[PDB]
Symmetry: none
Subunit: 180 residues, 4 copies
C-alpha cells in the first residue's frame, strides 16, 4: 500500500508518559485493548463496506483551484484507510502506534497533506473539521460491529476512545507551541 | 526564546550536596565564578560568531548535523537548528553569568534530558534522531571547551582563568547530564 | 607492574568505527598524535612529580581517597594506592606514547571497567569501595587535564598542542569508560 | 528481548535478486514457506526444550561454549549465554514464521555479522571471543538442522516437509552469513 508507513515513521515529539496519560484520559484500558482486538475480528471482512461509506469533505481530496476531486488521491488514501481500520483494532497502542498516529495527523495538516501521494491538493485540513469528524467516524462503525450488546458496546466504546485519542494526538501540530 | 526554560523547570533528582561535591570535584570555586562572570563580559558581543562556529542552519555542523536531522531521511531540520541555536546562544551567557545554584543545576539537568531520548526533539516538536549517545556528549566536552578560547582572547592568566572556568563548567554540565544516561546506581 | 595489563586484555565491545568516530568527535588527529608523543618526551622524567600530585598512599589525594579505602572503615588501602599509582604512572606514558589503536582502546575499556563495579578492586585483590560513580569519572576530566599542563611547560603553541592533545585523550578515555556505566542503548 | 533487532537493522548489501536466487538455489518455494509456518505451529511450545539442547548457562554444551566465553580466561559468560539464548528462542520462531523478505534477509545478515568479528559481543556488551570462524558456522548447519527434527515429530511427509524447510532455511541463512566472512569478490 503506497504511503502506508506504519512502523516506518520518525519518532513523534510526544513522550511515552504523555501518551500513557492520554490513554488514561480517554480511559483506554486493557478491556478496551481486547474489545479493539475483538472488533478487529468483526470488522475484518467488512472493510470494503466500511470504505464505501467513507472514502474513495470531498473538497479536501480535490484540487483546490478547480475543485475537482483527485481519483488516485481518493484511491490511495482509501487503501491506507482500510488498513487504518485494522490498525485501530489490532495494533498494540505502543510507541510505534503513537508514531504512526502522529504521522497520520501530519498528513491531514499542512505539514505533509498531499505529500504522500504527490498530489496537488487542498494544503490543509482545518483542525475544527478533524475534531468534528470524531463523531461520524465513531458512529459509522457501530452497525459494522453489530452485523455479527455489551460486546458491541465494549467494541464500540473502544473504537470511540481510539478515534478520540488519535485526534488528540493529531491536534499537536495544529496547536500553538505550548497549548497542546 | 521558544523552549528556553531556564528557571522554569522541575527539580532535578540530584541533591544539593551531590551538586556541591560535583563542583568541588571539577574544582569550580569562587575564583572560577568570577572568571565565568568576566568571560560573560568578554563573550557578550561575540555570541553570533560563536554560534556560527557551532550551530545553526548555515553553520559548521561536523558529523553531528545528523542529530539535528530527520533520522529516516537524514535531512537537517532548519527550525530545529534555528531554535536550538538561539537557546545555545543563551546558554553561552547562562554558563558565564548565572550563579551555579539549584536553579542552574535544574536547567543543566533539563538540558541533559533534551539530549537524551527522554526529551530530545520534544522542546521543538520536531521528528528527529531520538537520542544523542552519551559517548558523544562526553567527547563534545573537548570541542565545546576549546572552541571558546579564541573568543576569550579576542579582547593570559585572565584568559586561562576564564578558559579553565569554562572548561570546569562544560565538564560539570556533562557530568550532570550523564545521570539520565547512566544505569540506576552507577552515576 | 602488577595488574598493568596493557596489550593483554580482552576485546572491548566497541567497534573500530565507533572508536574512529569517537576520535573524530574529540578532534584527535595526526597533529594530536605527535603532540602526544612530544608530551611523552616532556613528561617522561616528571612522572613521580605528577604522581605525587595525584595518587599514592602519601599523595595529595582529595576526598577521592575514599575510593581507595575500605568502605566499612574508611581507611585508605596503602597497597591499593601503591599499586594503582604505579599503573597510573604507566598510563601517563601510555597516554602520550601508545598509538591509539584497538590495543589502546581495549586497555582504556579495561581501565573504565576497573573504575566500575564490574572490576574495581579485583586487580589488586583489595576489599574496597565497589564502584566509582560516573559523575565523578566525568568531573575528573578537568583536574586530570589541567594538572598536567605545568609539567608540559616546565621544559606555547607546542605546550598548547601537547596540552590540547592530553585533553582530547582524557575526554576520549572517559567517553570510552562511560560504556559500562551507561543504560544498554544510551552510550 | 535485549539485542533482538528483527525489523530494526540496516539494509544488508545483498540485492533482492541475489536473495531470490539464493532461495531458488536452496529450493525454498511456496511449499517450504507453508511447511515453515506449520513448523512454527509445532515448535511454538517446545522452544525452551529446544533451547536447553542448544544454548544457555546450563544447556547441554558442545565445545562451542568457548565462543560464549571470555577468551583470556575461558570462563563462559552467563549473561551472554542468557541473552543470546533468548534471541535464539525468538530466531526459532522467526525462522518458521517470518516471511522471507528483505526485512528477514536484513536480520539474517545482522545475525551473521554478530557471529563475525564485525559485531560479535557488541550486542551484549561482553568481552568475548571476537570471532566465530566460518568453518564452524558451516559445520553447525548439520547439528542445528538435525536437532530440530524430533521436535517436529513430537506432535512423516508433514514432518519431512517441515524438516526440509528448516534445513533449507538454515542453509540459506548460513549462505547469507558467509558474505562478511568471504574475500571481496568470492561470495
Ligand atoms: C474533516 C475531517 C477529515 C478530512 C477532510 C479528512 C481527509 C483526509 C485526507 C485528504 C487524507 C489524505 C491526507 C494526505 O495524506 O494527504 C486523509 C488520510 C487519512 N485520514 Fe482523514 N480526514 C478527516 C478526518 C479524519 C479522522 C477523524 C480520521 C480517523 C481518526 C481520519 C483518518 C484518516 C486515515 C486513517 C488516513 C490515511 C492515513 C494514512 O496515510 O495511513 N481522518 N484524510
Ligand atoms: C559539551 C557538550 C554539549 C554542550 C555543552 C551542548 C549544549 C547544548 C545546549 C545549550 C543546547 C540547548 C539547551 C536548551 O534547549 O535549553 C543543546 C541542544 C542540543 N544539542 Fe547539544 N551540547 C553538547 C553536546 C551535543 C552533542 C554531542 C550533540 C550531537 C549532535 C548535540 C546536539 C544537540 C541537539 C540535537 C540539541 C537539541 C536537543 C533537543 O532536541 O532539545 N549537542 N546543546
Ligand atoms: C573521581 C574519579 C576517579 C577516582 C575516584 C579514581 C580512582 C581510581 C581507583 C580507585 C583506581 C584503581 C581501581 C581498580 O582497579 O580497582 C583507579 C585506576 C586508575 N585511574 Fe582512576 N579514578 C578516577 C578517575 C580517573 C580518570 C578521569 C582517569 C584518567 C582519565 C583515571 C586514571 C586512572 C588510571 C590510569 C588508573 C589505573 C588503571 C590501570 O589499572 O591500569 N582515573 N582510579
Ligand atoms: C560453531 C558455530 C556457531 C557458534 C560457535 C555460535 C555461537 C554463537 C554466539 C557466540 C552468538 C552470539 C554472538 C553475538 O555476540 O552477537 C550466537 C548468536 C546466535 N546464533 Fe550462533 N553460533 C554458531 C552458528 C550458528 C548457526 C548455524 C545458527 C542457526 C542458523 C546460529 C544461530 C544463532 C542465533 C539465532 C543467534 C542470535 C541472533 C540474534 O542475536 O538475534 N548460530 N551464536
Ligand atoms: Fe509540542
Ligand atoms: Fe539517580
Ligand atoms: Fe554496548
Ligand atoms: Fe559483497
Amino acid at each position: 500500500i503506497p504511503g502506508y508507513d506504519y512502523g516506518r515513521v520518525e519518532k513523534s515529539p510526544i513522550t511515552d508518559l504523555e501518551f500513557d496519560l492520554l490513554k488514561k484520559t480517554v480511559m483506554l484500558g486493557e478491556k478496551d485493548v481486547m474489545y479493539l482486538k475483538k472488533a478487529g475480528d468483526v470488522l475484518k471482512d467488512q472493510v470494503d463496506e466500511i470504505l464505501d461509506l467513507l472514502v474513495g469533505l470531498i473538497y479536501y481530496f480535490s484540487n483546490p483551484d478547480t475543485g475537482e476531486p483527485i481519483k488516485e488521491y481518493l484511491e490511495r488514501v482509501r487503501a491506507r484507510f482500510g488498513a487504518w481500520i485494522l490498525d485501530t483494532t489490532s495494533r498494540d497502542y505502543n510507541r510505534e502506534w503513537l508514531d504512526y498516529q502522529y504521522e497520520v495527523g501530519l498528513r491531514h495538516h499542512r505539514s505533509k497533506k498531499g505529500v504522500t501521494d504527490g498530489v496537488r491538493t487542498v494544503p490543509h485540513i482545518p483542525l475544527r473539521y478533524l475534531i468534528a469528524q470524531i463523531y461520524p467516524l465513531t458512529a459509522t462503525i457501530k452497525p459494522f460491529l453489530a452485523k455479527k450488546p455489551e460486546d458491541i458496546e465494549g467494541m464500540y466504546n473502544a473504537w470511540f476512545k481510539s478515534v478520540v485519542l488519535q485526534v488528540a494526538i493529531w491536534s499537536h501540530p495544529y496547536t500553538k507551541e505550548n497549548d497542546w
